[PDB]
Amino acid sequence: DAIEEKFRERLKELVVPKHVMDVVDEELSKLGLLDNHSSEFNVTRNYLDWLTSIPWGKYSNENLDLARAQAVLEEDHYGMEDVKKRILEFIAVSQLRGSTQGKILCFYGPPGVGKTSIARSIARALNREYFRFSVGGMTDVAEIKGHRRTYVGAMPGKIIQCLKKTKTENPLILIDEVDKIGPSSALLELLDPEQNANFLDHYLDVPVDLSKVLFICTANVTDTIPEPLRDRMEMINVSGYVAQEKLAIAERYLVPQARALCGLDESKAKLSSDVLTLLIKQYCRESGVRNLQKQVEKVLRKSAYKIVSGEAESVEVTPENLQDFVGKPVFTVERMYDVTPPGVVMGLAWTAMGGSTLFVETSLRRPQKDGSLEVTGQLGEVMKESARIAYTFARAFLMQHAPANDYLVTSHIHLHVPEGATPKDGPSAGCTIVTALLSLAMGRPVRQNLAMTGEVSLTGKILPVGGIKEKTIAAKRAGVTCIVLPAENKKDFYDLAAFITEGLEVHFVEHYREIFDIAF
Amino acid sequence: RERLKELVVPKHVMDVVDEELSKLGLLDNHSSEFNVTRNYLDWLTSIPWGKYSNENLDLARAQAVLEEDHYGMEDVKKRILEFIAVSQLRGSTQGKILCFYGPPGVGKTSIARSIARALNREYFRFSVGGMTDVAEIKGHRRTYVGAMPGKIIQCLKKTKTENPLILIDEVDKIGPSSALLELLDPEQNANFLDHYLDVPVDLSKVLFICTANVTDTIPEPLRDRMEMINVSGYVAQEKLAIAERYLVPQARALCGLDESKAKLSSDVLTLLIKQYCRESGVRNLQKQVEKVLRKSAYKIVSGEAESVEVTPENLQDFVGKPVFTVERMYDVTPPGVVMGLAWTAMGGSTLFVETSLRRPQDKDGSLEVTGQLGEVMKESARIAYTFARAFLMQHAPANDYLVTSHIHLHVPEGATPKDGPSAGCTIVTALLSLAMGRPVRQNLAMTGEVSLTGKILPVGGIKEKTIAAKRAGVTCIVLPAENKKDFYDLAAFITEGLEVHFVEHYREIFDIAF
Amino acid sequence: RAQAVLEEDHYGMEDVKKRILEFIAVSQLRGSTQGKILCFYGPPGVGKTSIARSIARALNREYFRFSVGAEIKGHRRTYVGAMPGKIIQCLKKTKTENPLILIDEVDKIGPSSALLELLDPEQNANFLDHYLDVPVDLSKVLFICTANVTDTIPEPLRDRMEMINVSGYVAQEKLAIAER
Ligand SMILES: Nc1ncnc2c1ncn2[C@@H]1O[C@H](COP(=O)(O)OP(=O)(O)O)[C@@H](O)[C@H]1O
Ligand SMILES: Nc1ncnc2c1ncn2[C@@H]1O[C@H](COP(=O)(O)OP(=O)(O)O)[C@@H](O)[C@H]1O
Ligand SMILES: Nc1ncnc2c1ncn2[C@@H]1O[C@H](COP(=O)(O)OP(=O)(O)O)[C@@H](O)[C@H]1O
Ligand SMILES: [Mg+2]
Ligand SMILES: [Mg+2]
Ligand SMILES: [Mg+2]
Description:
This is part of a larger assembly, with three copies of chain A. By secondary structure, chain A is α/β, with parallel strands linked by helices. Chain A is built from 21 helices and 18 strands. In chain A, 42% of the residues lie in helices and 16% in strands. In chain A, the strands form six sheets. Chain A has a five-stranded parallel β-sheet with strand order 2-3-6-1-7, with helices on both faces. A four-stranded mixed β-sheet of chain A has the order 10-11-13-12. In chain A, strands 14-17-18 form a three-stranded parallel β-sheet, with helices on one face. The longest helix of chain A is centred in the C-terminal third of the chain and has 21 residues, at 381-401. The relative contact order of chain A is 0.08. At the A-B interface, helix 14, strand 11 and strand 13 of A face helix 4, helix 7 and helix 13 of B. The complex binds adenosine-5'-diphosphate (3 copies) and magnesium ion (MG) (3 copies). The site of one magnesium ion has 2 residues of chain B, from helix 5. Chain B: One of its GO terms (biological process) is protein catabolic process. Chain B: ATP binds at residues 102-109.
C-alpha cells in the first residue's frame, strides 16, 4: 500500500540491524490488517513513524584533520586550551583508529566562560550535528526514557527526538546544567559505555546504538552532580578569565559580534581599548564576560541611536564620554580597606560565581571569669567550627609566644565578615581568623597588601584548600602583592599561567608559626 | 489550501498539511478522528506563516506617541527609541527580551501597550505568577480529548503576525523556570515547539516584555538573560500630573461623563494622593477617582444635580472619612528613636527604630531585639550594637550606658516581616542617641549597611527609599558614598529640597545627625 | 423602581444596593451596559446568587444562571447526541436577546478560553458555536459573576472582573431576614 511503500522508502538507505528490521516487519504486517479508522491503526502508524525516522545507519562525515580543526577552534574562542587539547586528542584518536567514536565530557566552571559556545564550536569543527536540552530542575524521568505506546500522550523522549532531528548516529548532544538536576537514574543508563550501545527507550521498545554519540555536559559545581553520574563522565575545568584575557576577548570577539548585532560598522562606532579596560575594571565584577557583553551591547545601542538620530555621522567611545553611554561606574571601589587597622586581615574566597576577596574583622565588645567570641556574617556551620578552632589555636599560640598577654583568654571579642548579607561557608578562612585574632590581641596590623587562605588545625597545621586558581585571580584583580598558601597547594598554584602570577610574592607554609613571621 | 495562498510557509509544514488533507479526504464526517483532524488542520491554516506587521520605524512619530501616552518613564522611552534605531540600522524587524521591574501600579503593563501602539505591533499579555505547571504555555497533544494548543499559538493566531508584543506578567513569582529559559533565550527562541502541533515556530522577532516587582526573587538564569529596566515610583507632584492628565480623563470617559458634568479640582486630587492613598503607584488613586466619578454619575442620573464639582469641602460625600490621617509615625522624634528607610516589593517605605531601657538601672548590658526582624537583620543589629559600644568607648569614655544598661530595640511595624542589613547605621544612631539622651535632627532620614569597624557599605533600592523619604517630608538624607550613582539617576525635581550627605564611615553620620 | 425592587427583594446590604444602583446609573449614562462585568464575592449564604436575580428584576431583563465546573461550546452537530452550548438555550427559553447571565462560582471552573470569548466586546457580537454554523450577536446581554474567593480564579478572568464585596450580616439583619 501507499503507507507501507512510504515507510520502506524512508528505510532504503539505512543499514538497519536485524532485530529492528524484524520489529519493523512485524509492525508493518500488523498495520496491513488493521482498519484505517482504528485507533490502534493510529498508534501503529505513529510508532512506525518514529522507527522509520531513526537514522540506523547514517553517520556524519567528520573532518578528521588536525590543522583545520585547530584553526576553527582557535578562531572561534580564546584561551580554552584544555578543551581544545581534549578535542584535538579526540580527533587524533579517531584518525588513528580509522573510525568514528563517542565520548562523554563535562565542562564545569563559572557562568559566562563559554561552555556552550565552545560546544557549538566543537560541533562545527568536527562537522557533527548539534543538539542540546536542559536537565536543570528536571524531575520527570519520562522525558528521557519516554512512555510506552499504551498511553495516549506517549513521547519517545529527548534522546529519540534528537536522533530524529539530527538524522545522524554521531551528533554532539549538550546536556545543560547537569548539576541542577532534581531523574538522574535515566541519565545513568543514557551515558554509560557498558550500555550505551543498547539504550532501550520505553516508546521504541527497541534498542538504539548511542556509542558514537559525543555527549558534552555543562555544570558550575561538580560536588552537586550526583555521585554515580559524576563517575561516568570526564571533568574538564573551564575556568574564568583574568582582566587581560577579558580585554582580548572583548577586542576580538565581543565587540565585533555586537557591532553586527546592532548593525553598525567599524567606521561608524569605534570602541577604544581604554574603554573596554574601564568597562572590565569598573562596570563588571565577574569571572566570565557575560556582563561585559551586555555593557558593550548597551554602548553600541547608544551609538546606533546617535547615528540614526543624526547627532553625529560617526561616534568614538572615549573614557571621557563613556558615562554618556553607560553612566557612572558601578564598581568604583575595588577593596574595602586600602590600609587595614589592627584586628582585620584580608582573605580570599571561592564560590560558584568564581573567586572573591573577603575581610575578617574583630573588635572588643566590652572594655578592658573567661572570655568569649561572638561570630556573625552569615557564616555556615563549617566556618563557625573553623572560627572556634581558630580561636582555640590563637589562645594556645599567644600563650607561648607572649605569656604575659592575657588578651585572648579574658577579653570578649566579636568577629564579623563585612559581607553581612551573603552566606559564607568553608574552612579556608581558619588561618585568616587566627591572624585577625592575633593582630587584635597584639595591636599590630598585618602587611598592608597581604592575602591568605588555608585551613587550620587545632595544633596549627595548615591544610590544603580548593579553588586556588579563582582565589589567585581575585587576588590579582584586587591588587594583592603577597599571597600565603598551604604547601600542599603548591602543585595547584604553579599550574597557573605566567601572566596570572608574574607579580605575586608567594609563600607556601606548613604550620602557622611561619605565617606569623610572614605577616608580622 | 485556499487559506495558505499568501503565506510564506516553512519547508517542513507543507508535508504535514498535505498528509492531513489526504487523511481527511478519506475519513467519514461523523467520526471523532475526522473532527480532530479538522481542528488540527484549522489550527495549522489559521496560524500565520511568514507574515509580519508593518512596524513603523519613525523615531519622531514613535517618540511623540510614547511621550503623549505616558508621563515620565525616561529610561523605558530611551530603550524603545534606541531599539527602533537599531532596527533601522539592521533594516529588518527584530525582537529582544526586556524586563520592566518596579513597584506595582507604576504603569509597567500600560507602557507595554503604549510601546505596542508606537511600534504598530500587536499586543498580548498573560500572567505567570499563578502558574506552576508547564502544559499551559504549550497545550496538549491532539490525542487528548478537548486539547488546545496552549496560549502562545492562540496569541500568534489572533494577532495574525509573526512579531507581536508579548507581555510576560508577574514573572518574579514563579511557583517552570526551565520552560521560560527555552522561550526567553535568543539561542533557542528561533525554534519553539508546541505540543498540540510539533512544528517549531520562529519567535526570534517577538518582543518579550517581562514584568516583575523585584529582581532578587527572579531565578538566576531568567534574570541573567533578560535586560533589567527599572520603572520607579512617583512623587506627589508626578502623581498629580498623572491623575490630571490620564487617570481622571480615562475614568471620566469610561463612566460616560464629560468635563462639563463632573470636575475634579487639583485640591481634591492632592487630598486623594496625600490621605486617601499610600503607595508608590497610582492604582489606589485610580480606584478612588473611579469611585468619585461613579458616584457623580449616580448623582447625575438620579436627578440630584445637573452638574457636580468635587471640592475638598464635600469630598467625604464621595469617598467618606480620610484614611491615613497621619503622614508619619513621629513628627518630633524622642531621643531613643531614629528615622529609617526600607525597600520592599511594594515600593519604598519609611521605618523607625525605637530603643528604650528594659531595666531601671541607669555583669554587662544586653540587647533584646523584636519586630519580626530577619536573621540577617538580627546579625546587623548585633554588629551595630558592638560598633555602638566601641564608638562610645572612644567618643565619651565616661559613658557606661551602652556597656551596662539593658536595652530593648523594636521596629514599630511589629506584624510585618522585615530583613536586610541596610538598617545597621540607623540602629547605631538609635543606640547612641538613647545613650546620650539626644534626639537626632527632626527631619533626618538615613540608611546603609555598617561593618564591625564602622565602614558604611552600599545598599539597594536607593531610588525607592528616596521616593518614600520625599513622601514622608524629610529634609536631610544620609546615604552610602557608593550609592551616589543610584541617587543621581533620579530626576532633578525629586532631589530639589533634600539636603544630601554621602558618607563612608560612621563618624560622618555622627557629625551630621548630632 | 430598580431601587424599590432591590429593597423589596433583599434586606440590609445598603452599601451593596448603592453599588448596583451606581452600576445602573453609569450604564444608563453610557447608553449601554457593555463594559466591566460585576463580580460579587463573599462568604457562603450571603445573598450573592439572589442579588443578581434582584438586579435582573430591577433592570426588567430576563434572568438565567449556569454554574461552571465544553458545555459552553456544546457538541458538534452529528447524529450522535448533538447539543450546543449553554448560552443558546438561554436565548431559547428567555425569549430575548438581552437576558441577564449569572456566572455562578467561577472558582470551580475546570473551558476558560471559551468563557473569555463571551467577555470580549470585539468578539461577543461574533459568538460561534459547534452546532450552529451561524454567528450570534450577544452585544445586548448582561453578565454578572459570583465567586467565594477571588485569588484562585483564572488570571485572564480576574483582570476583567470589577470586584464587589458582600460584607455579611449582623445578628439583627439575620433576624430580619429570617422573619421576612
Ligand atoms: N574565551 C572566549 N572567547 C570568545 N568568546 C567567549 C569566550 N568566553 C566567553 N565568550 C562569549 O561569552 C558568551 C558566553 O555565553 P555562554 O557560553 O552561553 O555562557 P556559559 O559560559 O555560562 O555557558 C558566548 O556568547 C561567547 O561568545
Ligand atoms: N506615568 C504614567 N503616565 C500615565 N499613566 C500612568 C502612569 N503610571 C501609571 N499610569 C496608569 O495607571 C494605571 C495602572 O497601572 P498598571 O499598568 O497597572 O501598573 P503596573 O503595570 O505597574 O501594575 C494604568 O492604566 C496607567 O494608565
Ligand atoms: N439580605 C438578604 N435578604 C433576603 N434574603 C437573603 C439575604 N441574604 C441571603 N438571603 C437568602 O439566603 C438564601 C441563600 O443565599 P444564596 O444566594 O444561595 O447564598 P450565596 O450568596 O452563597 O449563593 C437565599 O434564598 C436568600 O433568600
Ligand atoms: Mg551555557
Ligand atoms: Mg501591571
Ligand atoms: Mg452560593
